[PDB]
Amino acid sequence: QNACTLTAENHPSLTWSKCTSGGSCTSVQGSITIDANWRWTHRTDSATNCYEGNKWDTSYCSDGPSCASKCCIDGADYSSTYGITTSGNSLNLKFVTKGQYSTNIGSRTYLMESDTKYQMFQLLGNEFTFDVDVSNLGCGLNGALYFVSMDADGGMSKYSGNKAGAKYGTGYCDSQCPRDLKFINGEANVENWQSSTNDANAGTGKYGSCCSEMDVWEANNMAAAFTPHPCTVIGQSRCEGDSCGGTYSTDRYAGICDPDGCDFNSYRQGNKTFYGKGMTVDTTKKITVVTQFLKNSAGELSEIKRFYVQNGKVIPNSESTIPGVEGNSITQDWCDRQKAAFGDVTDFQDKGGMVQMGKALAGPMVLVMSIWDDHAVNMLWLDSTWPIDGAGKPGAERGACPTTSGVPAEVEAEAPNSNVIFSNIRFGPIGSTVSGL
């Protein structure tokens, strides 16, 4: 995709903290950019849309390279159009933003090191911490902070058709191999475009974009999970059609990434009073979330540990109480037992498990922060009973939301002013971001 400048692109600023062994932390001046799929896509020579509603203009261009050449993405009106604001080390993403001519739903954003480069993190062996407020995030919504193995420049150095780069939030990928991206590998995803049946702005193209994914945080004020998702190809790669896998496909496991992950949800692991409104981890208030990516002596990822801090008390992750799935952290062995007790597909195992996730964590990964609703499962996998008839079966109950919650059109209409606030990002070696773990 080319880049256009009918609208100035000014990344909202966002500071974060790099911490050293001993607890000393240094302020870093970063910023954030919005993902290209939310941007205006128009012809390079006019304001005429190349993509509008849920369609491409195929009277103008009709294949990947030519649309990538004749179309561009433009700047983004962060606050008034997308409901994205920052202040200091704090980022607020609003759910539905109604402007004069348009309605924006959700957002996906990336931390920048510079105007043209995502801030890369190498997580293995290290510690990542942030504060989050999910208090205004109800059933059916997901405020997500995670890492994916995108390239720092959005793919510019790999794909000559991508002339927009990280500045315009290009190059996305995750463990769902998403096919709704309008540009992948520097080529517009216009071939075999099929409009979504329930999302007025979306469709899927011939191609999807895969890469490793570490879901540090997927949460609302009812339920939370952290989930590694390995891929048999570590970095960004293009997939084709149904072989992409991911959930907007016929066989979600048919592709190269694990679409389920090895998930830890306190509620799903059997502790229903640990996380929620006024609970041990109280979701009406700001929560500090600590994640440690531990190595074994061979240098592989052996364990993911979670701690919470609220009002100065360190709260270790809740004990999983599912019989046979004892433990409060994610390990290969724990994941084997979890999949067994829940009767779930061992795709995590088949695609390389912890060791394969650690290969991604050893490399650079992009930090992404988003807010969204779910046009496939109404977020029931996160905060409800899933499958909907599975009450009493181990693994089915994930939160206390009703099985009728989460329908995008309904939650968009009822809770449009929902929002999530990510703030106070701290990163460094183990023990460096919060004292007294």
Ligand X SMILES: OC[C@H]1O[C@@H](O[C@H]2[C@H](O)[C@@H](O)[C@H](O[C@H]3[C@H](O)[C@@H](O)[C@@H](O)O[C@@H]3CO)O[C@@H]2CO)[C@H](O)[C@@H](O)[C@@H]1O
Ligand Y SMILES: *[C@@H]1O[C@H](CO)[C@@H](O[C@@H]2O[C@H](CO)[C@@H](O[C@H]3O[C@H](CO)[C@@H](O)[C@H](O)[C@@H]3O)[C@H](O)[C@H]2NC(C)=O)[C@H](O)[C@H]1NC(C)=O
Catalytic (active-site) positions: 213, 218
Q: Which stretch binds ligand Y (CB under 6 A): 213-221, 225-233, 318-326, 398-406?
A: 318-326
Our finding on whether 297 is near ligand MAN (CB under 6 A) is: no
Min CB(321)–ligand Y separation in Å = 5
**What is the C-alpha end-to-end distance of the chain, expressed in Å?**
46
Instruction: For residues 97 and 128, give the distance between their C-alpha atoms in angstroms, rounded to a whole number.
Output: 30
321 binds, among ligand Y, ligand MAN, ligand X, none (CB under 5 to 8 A by kind): ligand Y
198 binds ligand MAN (CB under 6 A): yes
Question: Of 197, 250, 297, 311, which lies in the binding site for ligand MAN, with binding defined by CB under 6 A?
Answer: 197
Peptide bond before residue 429 is cis, with ω within 30 degrees of 0: no
Window 374 to 403, contacts with ligand MAN (CB under 6 A): 376
Which of ligand MAN, ligand Y, ligand X, none does 346 bind, CB closer than 5 to 8 A by kind?
none
> Count of residues for the chain?
437
- Residue 185 Ramachandran class (φ > 0 left, ψ -120 to 50 alpha, else beta): left
By CB under 6 A, which span of 190-198, 314-322, 330-338, 364-372 interacts with ligand Y? 314-322
Which listed option, ligand MAN, ligand Y, ligand X, none, makes contact with residue 397 (CB within 5 to 8 Å by class)?
none
CA distances, 200 to each of 80, 243, 300, 324 (Å): 21, 25, 43, 44
> Judging by DSSP bridges, how do beta strands 419-429 and 13-19 pair with one another?
parallel
The correct pick among 375, 397, 419, 425 for binding ligand X (CB under 6 A) is 375
- Residue 94's CB is within 10 A of a number of other CB atoms, namely 20
Name which position in 1, 33, 37, 302 contacts ligand X (CB under 6 A): 37
- Binding partner of 197, given ligand Y, ligand X, ligand MAN, none, CB within 5-8 angstroms per partner class: ligand MAN
Question: φ and ψ at 29, to 5 degrees?
Answer: -90, 100
DSSP 70-99: HEEE----HHHHH-EEEETTEEEEESEEE-
* Interface pick for ligand Y out of 79, 280, 310, 349 (rule CB under 6 A): 280
The residue sitting closest to ligand Y, measured at its beta carbon, is 271
